[PDB]
């Protein structure tokens, strides 16, 4: 039995930590909603 609990407002934060790269990938999406890499 699943339940929900509030965790916060949805707002942009000035000076949030900035990280992560920006890869460009060829991918395929199957009927079950799974992504896979195309090589």
């Amino acid at each position: 039995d699943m339940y929900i609990e509030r965790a916060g407002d949805i707002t942009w934060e000035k000076d949030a930590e900035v990280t992560g790269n920006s890869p460009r990938l060829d991918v395929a999406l199957d009927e079950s909603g799974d992504f896979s890499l195309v090589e």
Partner: protein
């Protein structure tokens, strides 16, 4: 139940203790999450019940109480923020420049950030605070790192 707009954890007491299985967004009286988080099951909010209204396994999305309301889109150029809500941890914003998933049916923004599985459904936002999609359906790339699509629904 609580109907205030914002980000929510999705919990279950079926397993050991209270376990966070995902996250979602309440907007315009509709609860939005990824299909793999709830598998389309009903949800509780206090003493109230939220019933599924629309869902699609291939898009990996589900809405409760009404139709999908989120329609903002990544502009393809700017940094966005993941409003990560990890299990047992405070909601925290992380800013990043999305990458791209190129598919036979068009290109989708993607965020290269890894969190515990129960973080699925966390919203990705633009500079106006609009939700441009949900985090949690992605792929593991060559060097072993995780990249999530920015998954967005259609507002009819």
């Amino acid at each position: 139940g609580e109907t205030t707009d914002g980000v929510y954890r999705v919990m279950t007491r079926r397993l050991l203790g209270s376990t966070q299985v995902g996250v979602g967004v309440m907007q315009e009286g509709v609860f939005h999450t990824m299909w793999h988080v709830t598998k389309g099951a009903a949800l509780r909010s206090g003493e109230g019940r939220l019933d599924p209204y629309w869902g699609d396994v291939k898009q990996d999305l589900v809405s409760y109480c009404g139709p999908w309301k989120l329609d903002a889109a990544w502009d393809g150029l700017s940094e966005v923020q993941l409003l990560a809500v990890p299990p047992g941890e405070r909601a925290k914003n992380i800013q990043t420049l999305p990458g791209i998933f190129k598919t036979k049916d068009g290109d989708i923004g993607a965020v290269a950030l890894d969190y515990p599985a129960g973080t699925s459904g966390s919203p990705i936002l633009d500079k106006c605070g609009r939700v441009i999609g949900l985090y949690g359906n992605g792929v593991v790339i060559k060097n072993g790192s995780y990249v999530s699509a920015i998954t967005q629904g259609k507002r009819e």
